[PDB]
Amino acid sequence: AMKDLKGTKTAENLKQGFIGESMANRRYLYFAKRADEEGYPEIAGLLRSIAEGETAHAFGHLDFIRQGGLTDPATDKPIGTLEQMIESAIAGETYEWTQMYPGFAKVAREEGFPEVAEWFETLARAEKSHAEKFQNVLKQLKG
Amino acid sequence: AMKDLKGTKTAENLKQGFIGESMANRRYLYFAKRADEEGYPEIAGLLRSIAEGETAHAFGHLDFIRQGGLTDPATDKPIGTLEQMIESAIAGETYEWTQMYPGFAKVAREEGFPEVAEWFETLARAEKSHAEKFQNVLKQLKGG
Ligand SMILES: [Cl-]
Ligand SMILES: [Cl-]
Ligand SMILES: [Fe+3]
Ligand SMILES: [Fe+3]
Ligand SMILES: [Fe+3]
Ligand SMILES: [Fe+3]
Ligand SMILES: [O-]
Ligand SMILES: [O-]
């Protein structure tokens, strides 16, 4: 591996860089769909290509995070081995279905946004399904 | 009014949901590559399929954000129209190349991590290129 990054500002900067690059890929693919609808195929293709750049950037941030002994930006769990990667996926999905999306749904209903609440409730059930499927993966890797 | 979400906690939750879903898709595609190398194609395929779920979630969050008159989670700029979307991309990439990545690179060098610094410098130049390409897009939308 590489030099230990724990405790540095660079460790936090890699995390923040990963967050921004992740958002950018999602944003640019969403924007490309609007270009698609409106008939701007060269713009849409450029947006998709820039999005591939942001993928490369996000993955490179993860490379340095993993090689520097740091944890997953999303879950604060190690992601050195495949088993650890799956354990990180389980931890994040579990946070999302047990805490995050149910709370978002409750708040949306309290604030008078039942349609948004229904979306958050759909997502809560979806993340529970994801968590169960990843748990099945881990069981198979450890057997 | 679901069409005016400004200032509500639900607005903040949509933003945070978008951030988490965006990271999840990137993480699961990265993890899939390790499964690929090691010969676990069913695990890799599951990671890729779940990642498509996280794409749908992120895009749905953006749908509610736009429909509610809220701004881009990354830039705090409106993203209703295509021109606005491109203007948001320009603002974010400009921040990344003029401030964010150069600052990250300086810190990495000062902390004794030259390989990470070089990566941040490569990314700074890349985001400058991205900003210029988005600027060209805006020129084309405006008539160029
Ligand atoms: Cl075009
Ligand atoms: Cl497999
Ligand atoms: Fe980037
Ligand atoms: Fe999830
Ligand atoms: Fe999700
Ligand atoms: Fe960028
Ligand atoms: O980026
Ligand atoms: O998720």
Numbering used by the authors:
A (entry chain B): 0 to 142
B (entry chain A): 0 to 143
Article, verbatim:
One such protein is sulerythrin (SulE), a ruberythrin-like protein isolated from the thermophilic archeon Sulfolobus tokodaii. SulE lacks the characteristic C-terminal, rubredoxin-like FeS4 domain of ruberythrins and contains a binuclear metal centre that coordinates iron and zinc when isolated from S. tokodaii. In contrast to other members of the ruberythrin family, a crystal structure of native SulE shows that it forms homodimers through domain swapping, with each monomer contributing two α-helices to give two four-helix bundles that each harbour a solvent-accessible, single dimetal site. The exact function of SulE is unknown, but it is presumed to be involved in reactions against oxidative stress.
Diffraction data from a crystal of recombinantly expressed SulE reconstituted with iron (diFe-SulE) were collected on beamline BL14.1 at the BESSY II electron-storage ring operated by the Helmholtz-Zentrum Berlin (HZB). The beamline flux was set to 5% to minimize radiation-induced damage to the metal centres for initial characterization. The edges for Fe-2 and Fe-4 are shifted to higher energies by 2 eV compared with Fe-1 and Fe-3. This indicates that Fe-2 and Fe-4 are in a more oxidized state than Fe-1 and Fe-3 and are likely to be ferric irons, based on the observation that an increase in oxidation leads to an edge shift of between 1 and 5 eV in model iron compounds.
